């Protein structure tokens, strides 16, 4: 498969024009992205919105003007010529016939497969407010590529200045433990019991995680040999805890010297 | 899986299923004869006139009797030993996948030559050389132990069957339920 | 009190022994009186049935009793590593 890398400038810029148009839940915003789709890692360095209009009672009604897209491509050649149209994004959680049929419309001006994006305006759950989806002609199915967030040296720190240890790092561990619990229980209970969907295609991938207390009890005897490195870490740390007494004993000379000067 | 493409009559579906049946007789690849059950193949044919060979081999894997299927076939496919060799492989592949998650709830990975002997209806000498043939074909990865009479094999290839591992996937998460309390409260107290 | 002392140690040290050593080493007089000590915890004397008299069984799965344990909880084991949190802060 391929990979997706989107800078944080593109993600937040897509959310701004959503509120600036006073778009409610009955309407959704659609836009296009720019970058280099030739390599295996899709990078999105730019984004632009579009005047998308849709009826809430009909999924077959949409408004898409390619003349604004043709003009947008001509306006970008005077700014950044290295950028080409790699696909298109859209807002809203729901996927209806409006966004599914237009995927072939952007294909005329896009050499690669248009990369579909769902931008969550409320940012509900985990990370990644925007998900990168790709479609296949062979049956069509929406698959998510390993979308990541990365930018340049000045772009990553630039948002840090605008926004501005061991126990805190362990807090995110428990959040990932409940992610394993809540994702499997809610999904597996939907396939079983009432309303069996067509499946056993996905089940092969699900049980592929469980084979390799989720992993292996056969290494329990060998685990004690793997735990030895943990016991070794306590060998030096016992002296490291005593190494704090080195400075603790040296600092005793300071206060003892203060009693002499006093 | 494609309904609109390849539109043929009812009589041609049985001839197409006949080619699908004889193709899976000589190889174990791509699941087993039970793969065509969920696909619109075995349900579109008739259970008589030697079109039930796909259904007879479904229960023949658990029963492990070659004489039942050999009496319902002709001399064409019964004169080749490859049919009997690869049929016994699918019978073992079901048992080889019982080492991780099938029956045992504790996910303890163990297999003995005595358990596979009763499943494949073979003595202890034939099952030792039979496991090597299944590993050499690229089915599963692992080794065996002749000294302690043990077989250690992992699980790789998924199957089409369901309902055996459904209860355990939730039961393995029950052990995660009891782990939310002790480390959840003590970490927030720090 | 003497017969409640010696045989405590016979658990780990002595693997097996017939009824001859029970009458001799422990100095028991009447037969079948040991059977009265054999009632509840099931003494087929043939090899080692002990742990009824002279303390108790070995049980298994010791957790959440006193100080540190083995199987289920790594937290109190981690608490020693987390003990420096309150000291440094």
Explain what this protein looks like in three dimensions.
This is part of a larger assembly, with chains A (262 residues), B (190 residues) and C (89 residues). Chain A has eight helices and ten strands. By secondary structure, chain A is α/β, with parallel strands linked by helices. Chain A has an eight-stranded mixed sheet with strand order 9-8-7-6-2-3-1-10. Chain A is extended and about 85 Å long. Chain A starts with a strand and ends with a helix. Chain B is mostly helical. Chain B is flat. By secondary structure, chain C is mostly helical. At the A-B interface, α5 and α6 of A face α9 and α10 of B. Chain B: This is 26S proteasome regulatory subunit RPN9. Chain B: Belongs to the proteasome subunit S11 family. Chain B: Acts as a regulatory subunit of the 26S proteasome which is involved in the ATP-dependent degradation of ubiquitinated proteins. Chain B: Residues 1-158 form the PCI domain.
Largest interface: A-B, 29 and 34 residues
SSE succession of chain B: HHHHHHHHEEHH
What does the radius of gyration of chain B come to?
A: 21 Å
Shape of chain B: flat
* Largest sheet geometry of chain B: 2 strands, antiparallel
Radius of gyration of chain C (Å): 21 Å
Strand-residue fraction of chain C?
A: under 5%
Q: Number of helical segments of chain B?
A: 10
Helix and strand sequence of chain C: HHHH
Separate helix tally of chain C? 4
Task: Indicate the structural class of chain B.
Answer: mainly alpha
Net shape of chain C? elongated
Provide the helix percentage of chain C.
25-40%
- Could you give the count of β-strands of chain B? 2
**What is the terminal-to-terminal distance of chain B?**
56 Å
> What is the spatial order of strands in the main beta sheet of chain B?
1-2
Structural class of chain C: mainly alpha
How would you characterize the largest beta sheet of chain C?
A: none
Into which percent range does the helicity of residues of chain B fall?
A: 40-55%
PDB class: hydrolase
Keywords: Proteasome, K48-Ub4, Ub-bound, cryo-EM, hydrolase
Entry title: yeast proteasome in Ub-engaged state (C2)
Chain A: 26S proteasome regulatory subunit RPN8
